[PDB]
Each structure stands twice: as C-alpha cells, then as structure tokens.
Design a protein around this ligand. Sequence first.
Ligand SMILES: Nc1ccc(/N=N\c2cccc(F)c2F)c(N)n1
Lengths: 95, 199, 21
Amino acid sequence: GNLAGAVEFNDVKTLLREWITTISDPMEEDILQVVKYCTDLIEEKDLEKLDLVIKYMKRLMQQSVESVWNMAFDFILDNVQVVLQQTYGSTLKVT
Amino acid sequence: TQLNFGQVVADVLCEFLEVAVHLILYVREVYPVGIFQKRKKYNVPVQMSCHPELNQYIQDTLHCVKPLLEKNDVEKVVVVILDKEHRPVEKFVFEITQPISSDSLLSHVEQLLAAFILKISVCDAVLDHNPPGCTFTVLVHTREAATRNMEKIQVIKDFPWILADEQDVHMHDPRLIPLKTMTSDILKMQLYVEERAHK
Amino acid sequence: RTANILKPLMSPPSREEIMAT
Ligand SMILES: Nc1ccc(/N=N\c2cccc(F)c2F)c(N)n1
C-alpha cells in the first residue's frame, strides 16, 4: 500500500500531482511502480483508495496534451483491470 | 535446423525451459513422483508431469515468456521453491545473455542443453534436502524496466502477470551452487542455484 | 524500486489439489 515512500492517501496525490504536471517524458520505472501500487491496493482489499487514485490519475493524465500521459493512463488502467478481472471477476466502472 | 527469425532461439529456449521446469519439480519432490512418466529429451532421460493443470500452468507461463525472448528482453528466468510458509528456500536461476541464420548449428546448442538437464538430474548431490510442503513460482528478470514487457506478457487470458513483491524475491544468506555455463554465438546461458543458509 | 521482476498472479496447483486424483 506504498507508492515510492508515500503510505497515506493525501501524500500519494501530492506525488502524482507533482510527477504528472512537471515531467514531460515519465520514466517507465515510475509508470510500473504506480501499477504495483495499484495492484497492491487490490490485494490489500482497498477498492475505494483504488477508484480514488484511478479517478485522479485520469484527470491529470487525460487533460495532458502530451499523448505520453494519455497512453500512460491507458497502460496503468489495462493492468489494473486484468488483475481485478481475475481476483474479483469484475472491472472498475470508470465514468 | 532451418528458417524463422530470432524465434527458433525462442522455441529452443521455451522447449528447454518446459523440460527444465518439469525435471526441477521431480528432483526436488515438489509434487509426488506418482504424477511423473520417464521420457527422452536431448537424447537424455527426463521426467514430465502428465497432471494436465500443472502442465497447463507451466505451458501458459512459458507462452507468455516467448515474446520477451524473441526480442531478447529477459535477464533471467527463475524457478523459486517456497516453503509451506511462502518463504523462498532455493532458486533455479537461468541467466541468459544476448549475443546469420542457423542451419545445423542449432543441433549443436541442442547438445549443450543436454548437460544442463543432466546437471539437474543429479543435483540432490550439491544441494541440502528441501523441507516438506514446498510449492514453486516463476520470476522473470527483464534487462530494463519497460511497459513494452508488461504488454508483451499479458497475452494469455485468465493468466495475468504482476510486478513481484520483495517478499517474492528476498532470500537471506543465500549460497551459490553453479550447475552449468555455456557459450555458443546464439546462446550464452548459466544455470545456478541460490540456496538458503538453513531450511 | 524493483520494476524489472515479473510474476504470474496465479499460483501453480498446490500439492493438495494434485494429491486428490
Ligand atoms: N528517478 C526517478 C525516480 C522516481 C521519480 N518519481 N518520483 C520520485 C523522485 C525521487 C525519488 C523517488 F523514489 C521517486 F519516486 C522520478 N521523478 N525520478
């Protein structure tokens, strides 16, 4: 339930706000570290924290002109879903 | 023998791995002997589960790995034996190294791969007895972290992949038992075992 | 910080599941 040092949820939004809006080619290591954070929310039985981080990330990454972040979010979401599809038998409804 | 790109290198390795994984499960008694049948690979006795779910899990595992080998993205393929408490006990580690066509040079690397198999057959001799109730998992070390890796492996459905935890990798005070190294132009592979201090 | 290690989410069938025909 840890993203690069951050455990609390307001901390984790601090990071993703910083990381998405400053940087212009996200390091691949970072995108996978976030996938791991997400897949960890599933094992740890915290779907609310999962919908919340996915909803946030969708705002910043899809509001980017930089198709880099649009496709980052498409990679992240695709990985979360295959894992929810196999442990809960369902996919997150994303509004 | 003949034809196809860097994907006889891949079906060579995969076939090798299917046999390797099966024989590790036999020589380290992860499954009862009952489920096994003697067979012949690389002109060498091997052993092979015919429990069809086990066979599928291993098949599905390696099919997912094929794509990553085709473009030589894999640093190692690790067979991890965990104890009944989910704690890594030992690690079969295939280190794989990168370096026209093929011809009957391939039937030279089929030969080099027999020695690996034989090393696994008699490897109760260099390794401590394993504690009972062990299971096994498969770790893939890639060369660098890359999304293209996670999109290339998520092929087989009902069989997704995740980034391993530190609880899936860590082994305390691990001893190194090298089994076989091998240099051809096509393939440079080491097999070594990492073994826990105690069990 | 170890994002180059991949793993099946699913486990192989256990010794139990097998030791049951
Ligand atoms: N090389 C990196 C690694 C991660 C990055 N994302 N934020 C972090 C910054 C420092 C340390 C850390 F762990 C971070 F996650 C980053 N911008 N660069």
